[PDB]
Design a protein around this ligand. Structure first.
Ligand SMILES: [Ca+2]
Ligand SMILES: [Ca+2]
Ligand SMILES: [Ca+2]
Ligand SMILES: [Ca+2]
Ligand SMILES: [Ca+2]
Ligand SMILES: [Ca+2]
Ligand SMILES: [Ca+2]
Lengths: 147, 98, 147
């Protein structure tokens, strides 16, 4: 009588919700307070706690691409500007200048285990006589690959 | 969802489930996959916008305790579509029994 | 006698009512009160609470496209204008300028769980001598994909 259609089923579901990374930012105001910057002046500014990376319990490798997009603008104001991106635990993984504007800071599973804080060190010299107020520098952070 | 109640005589049933308005829900959904949960954890049926016919059959051990057919649906509503009270109608056919 | 037409039926209904997202706006009046903007002036303006996203209990991923449509108009008035769209919890996901006018801020399930407030930071310099009153800047918000 009944000729059973021999076909049973099994199923499953996978939930991919979050993105691997969170770039929490604390922007810098470099002349700061209780310090001063003059026109034509030379020196160094540093912020130790600038870009924080927070990852899920699953992600263990990240490769970030930092990009300086308005570098053609700060060229009209600065003579040399060299940004050093201080890595997790004293490592320095990044270097940005008016000429060379792309960095490739990558992070491993030991560094992500304790929170990757990316401070910034800046070496500068304001072009001769230029006087400005609240100049912006904007950096593009791209997560290129992860695992 | 679908309960099968049989007489004390019937012990084998072969049902054909058919999705008839699948050409309509295509205008609204991107993928729709219905899984017909069989009697005691078995899964005997699968319906999609493309593949619309199922052949869930039932044996004498399963009919002895009542065959309840739940439904699991995986869906994604097409981009931006806004609707209210859409119907999906399934044809249940008893093809053979004994 | 009766030759039963063996055909029974089962049915169901699905109710899709709402759209995934609500863009609640609090527009900005940037010269504000108890502050002042001058012609040819330079500086920064910021509004922390500008675009609020409210989602249903079902939606967990949104990808928004922000677009600056009258950027060709503010070019006649401004020298540089750079809008930074401050994301949910300190992240910065968006950048709009007179040249580059499209942004792609996307949001994950952890950020939508607490309300995505999109503040705005603006860096500007009014072209030399231009004097205007109540200039509009209009941004197109598009929900491109969701799930
Ligand atoms: Ca290491
Ligand atoms: Ca990967
Ligand atoms: Ca059995
Ligand atoms: Ca028969
Ligand atoms: Ca609404
Ligand atoms: Ca996130
Ligand atoms: Ca979708």
């Amino acid at each position: 009588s009944v000729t059973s259609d021999r076909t049973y089923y099994g199923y499953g579901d996978v939930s991919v919700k979050n993105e691997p990374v969170n770039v929490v930012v604390s922007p810098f105001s470099f002349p700061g307070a209780n310090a001063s910057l003059s026109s034509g002046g030379q020196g160094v500014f540093k912020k130790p706690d600038w870009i924080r990376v927070v990852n899920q319990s699953d992600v263990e490798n990240v490769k970030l691409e930092i990009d300086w997009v308005n570098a053609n603008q700060a060229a009209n104001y600065f003579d040399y500007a060299r940004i050093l991106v201080t890595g997790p635990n004293g490592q320095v993984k990044g270097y940005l200048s008016l000429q060379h504007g792309k960095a490739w800071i990558t992070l491993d599973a030991e560094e992500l285990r304790e929170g990757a804080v990316l401070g910034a060190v800046m070496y500068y010299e304001v072009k001769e006589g230029v006087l400005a107020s609240r100049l912006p520098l904007v950096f593009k952070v791209r997560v290129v690959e992860t695992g």
